[PDB]
Amino acid sequence: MKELIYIEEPSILFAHGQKCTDPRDGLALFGPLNQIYGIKSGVVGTQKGLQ
Amino acid sequence: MKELIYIEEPSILFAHGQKCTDPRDGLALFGPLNQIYGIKSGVVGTQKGLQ
């Protein structure tokens, strides 16, 4: 009766060589893969925009 | 036999608003004025150059 096939869900590699299926959960548990020490930002806009 | 005038040596500021005269000593005792979190390097050259 027109059988359906099932494909599994892929796994994405987080830090420490670990695997998960939801990026939010993997990021919250293990963390990103590479180390950039900081993000120096720049803001263009009105004073209210900076606030 | 004329006359020579003495000019006081200038002072260069450092972190915490401290004053010194030698950049080496001032940097060692107090440190830089701004915070860049890190230096992400990049090397162009032969493998021996990288080593």
Coordinates of C-alpha atoms in Angstrom, one line a residue:
Chain A
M1 CA 0.0 0.0 0.0
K2 CA 2.8 2.3 -1.1
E3 CA 5.3 1.8 1.7
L4 CA 7.2 4.8 2.9
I5 CA 10.9 4.7 3.7
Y6 CA 12.6 6.5 6.7
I7 CA 15.8 8.4 6.6
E8 CA 17.7 9.1 9.9
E9 CA 18.7 12.6 11.1
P10 CA 22.3 13.7 10.4
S11 CA 24.8 14.4 13.2
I12 CA 26.8 17.6 13.5
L13 CA 30.2 17.5 15.3
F14 CA 30.6 20.0 18.1
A15 CA 33.7 20.5 20.3
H16 CA 35.6 17.6 21.8
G17 CA 34.6 15.4 18.9
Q18 CA 31.1 15.1 20.2
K19 CA 27.9 14.7 18.1
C20 CA 24.3 16.0 18.5
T21 CA 21.3 16.7 16.4
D22 CA 20.1 20.1 17.7
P23 CA 22.7 22.9 17.4
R24 CA 21.3 24.7 20.4
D25 CA 21.7 21.7 22.7
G26 CA 25.1 20.8 21.4
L27 CA 26.3 24.4 21.8
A28 CA 24.9 24.7 25.3
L29 CA 26.5 21.4 26.4
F30 CA 29.8 21.2 24.6
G31 CA 30.5 24.5 22.8
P32 CA 32.0 25.9 19.6
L33 CA 34.9 24.3 17.8
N34 CA 37.5 27.1 17.5
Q35 CA 38.9 29.7 19.8
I36 CA 38.7 33.4 18.8
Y37 CA 39.7 35.4 21.9
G38 CA 37.1 38.2 21.6
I39 CA 34.8 40.2 19.4
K40 CA 35.7 43.9 19.1
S41 CA 32.5 45.6 17.8
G42 CA 31.7 48.9 16.1
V43 CA 28.4 50.8 16.1
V44 CA 27.2 53.2 13.5
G45 CA 24.0 55.1 14.3
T46 CA 22.3 57.7 16.5
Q47 CA 23.0 58.0 20.2
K48 CA 19.7 56.2 20.9
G49 CA 21.1 53.4 18.7
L50 CA 24.2 53.1 20.9
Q51 CA 22.1 53.1 24.0
Chain B
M1 CA 81.9 80.5 28.7
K2 CA 78.2 80.7 27.7
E3 CA 75.4 78.8 29.4
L4 CA 73.6 75.5 28.7
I5 CA 69.9 75.1 29.6
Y6 CA 68.5 71.8 30.8
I7 CA 65.2 70.5 29.5
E8 CA 63.3 68.0 31.7
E9 CA 62.7 64.6 30.2
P10 CA 59.1 64.0 29.0
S11 CA 56.8 61.4 30.7
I12 CA 54.7 58.9 28.7
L13 CA 51.5 57.7 30.3
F14 CA 50.6 54.0 30.7
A15 CA 47.7 52.0 32.2
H16 CA 45.8 53.3 35.3
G17 CA 47.0 56.8 34.5
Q18 CA 50.5 56.2 35.7
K19 CA 53.5 58.1 34.4
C20 CA 57.0 56.9 33.6
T21 CA 59.9 57.6 31.2
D22 CA 61.1 54.2 29.8
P23 CA 58.5 52.4 27.7
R24 CA 59.9 49.0 28.8
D25 CA 59.6 49.7 32.5
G26 CA 56.2 51.3 32.2
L27 CA 54.8 48.4 30.1
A28 CA 56.3 45.9 32.6
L29 CA 55.0 47.5 35.8
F30 CA 51.6 48.8 34.6
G31 CA 50.8 47.4 31.1
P32 CA 49.2 48.6 27.9
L33 CA 46.4 51.2 27.6
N34 CA 43.9 49.2 25.6
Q35 CA 42.5 45.6 25.6
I36 CA 42.7 43.6 22.4
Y37 CA 41.8 40.1 23.6
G38 CA 44.4 38.3 21.4
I39 CA 46.5 38.2 18.3
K40 CA 45.4 35.7 15.7
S41 CA 48.5 35.1 13.7
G42 CA 49.1 34.2 10.1
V43 CA 52.3 32.8 8.5
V44 CA 53.3 32.9 4.9
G45 CA 56.5 31.0 4.0
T46 CA 58.1 27.6 3.7
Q47 CA 57.6 24.8 6.2
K48 CA 61.0 25.6 7.8
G49 CA 59.8 29.1 8.2
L50 CA 56.7 27.9 10.1
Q51 CA 58.8 25.7 12.3

